[PDB]
Amino acid sequence: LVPAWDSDIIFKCLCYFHTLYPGLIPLETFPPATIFNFKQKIISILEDKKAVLRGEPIKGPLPICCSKENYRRHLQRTTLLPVFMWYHPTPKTLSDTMQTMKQLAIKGSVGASHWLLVIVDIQARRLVYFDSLYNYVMPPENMKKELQSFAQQLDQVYPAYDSKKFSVKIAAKEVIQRGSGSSCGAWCCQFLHWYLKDPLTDALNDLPVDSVERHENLASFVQACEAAVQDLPELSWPEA
């Protein structure tokens, strides 16, 4: 009784978050990033930011629902990439992950599929990894090491003025989404909103223990989001 946010409603919620926090670029979720290509996707966005900062053309392709001029403006302004990752345990490649996702979508079934969020905070030079199921993909200390290596590539790809290094944070210390099959999308957008309000958010440590109470507060958050996006344009990037 707090249902599944698909890629559509996650996208709209991100558009809405942009209008509150312009630094956030509302990256599309169709087709989404995966465990296999999220690094390439991020690198490619930051190379496009660098290009735009130099008045150069961009490479990486246009988002489907965004004009070229508007995308450039977003890339210029953005200080935060919300990368939504669609995962399933069975597929072993990008090609198979894509094929699996298309199969469950064309059946409208859920499966063992799951949303993760990686936040690239460019201002703070911080990678934040949020898994509402704690270790659905791999243990957190292993994700940490994998992301620290990634963080060193980003130091080369997107240097700071003073060689300040990208740091890594694993957000969830425990399973957050307790006894719920479907709430992973919503949790991702809740955590993102907390982070936009306060990048040093302790909101995950401050949760109620009671799983039901927790999911009621989330149901609140979800209704407030659904109200705010009701009138907002469909399949259409906000103008930066």
- The mark string for 181-220 relative to Cl ion (x by CB under 5 A, - otherwise) is ----------------------------------------
* Shortest reach from residue 42's CB to Cl ion, in Å: 15
Q: Which residues are identified as catalytic?
A: 114, 131, 184
Cα–Cα nearest to 176, from 164, 163, 185, 165: 185
Distance CA 156, CA 166 (A): 10
Which DSSP string corresponds to 30-91?
SSPB-TTTHHHHHHHHHHHHHHHHTTPPP-SPPPTTS-HHHHHHHHHH--EEEEEEEE-SS-
Q: Which is nearer to Cl ion, 25 or 127 (CB)?
A: 25
* Number of chain positions touching Cl ion (CB under 5 A): 5
Cross-strand pairs, 239: none
Q: Which is nearer to Cl ion, 110 or 235 (CB)?
A: 235
- The mark string for 59-88 relative to Cl ion (x by CB under 5 A, - otherwise) is ---------------x--xx----------
Q: Which is nearer to Cl ion, 17 or 38 (CB)?
A: 17
* Shortest reach from residue 70's CB to Cl ion, in Å: 10
* Shortest reach from residue 18's CB to Cl ion, in Å: 6
* Shortest reach from residue 80's CB to Cl ion, in Å: 8
Distance CA 198, CA 2 (A): 25
* Shortest reach from residue 208's CB to Cl ion, in Å: 33
**Residue 16 φ/ψ, nearest 5 degrees:** -65, -40
Can you give the length of the chain in residues? 240
Q: Which two tokens stand for residue 74?
A: 């977003």
Q: 177-180: list long-range contacts, CB under 8 Å, 24+ apart.
A: 177/132, 177/133, 178/211, 178/214, 178/215, 179/211, 180/2, 180/211, 180/215
Q: Which is nearer to Cl ion, 74 or 214 (CB)?
A: 74
Q: Which is nearer to Cl ion, 47 or 96 (CB)?
A: 47
Cα angle at 84 between 83 and 85, to 5 degrees?
115
Taking CB under 5 A as the criterion, the residue among 2, 10, 15, 25 binding Cl ion is 25
- Per CB under 5 A, residues contacting Cl ion are 25, 74, 77-78, 240
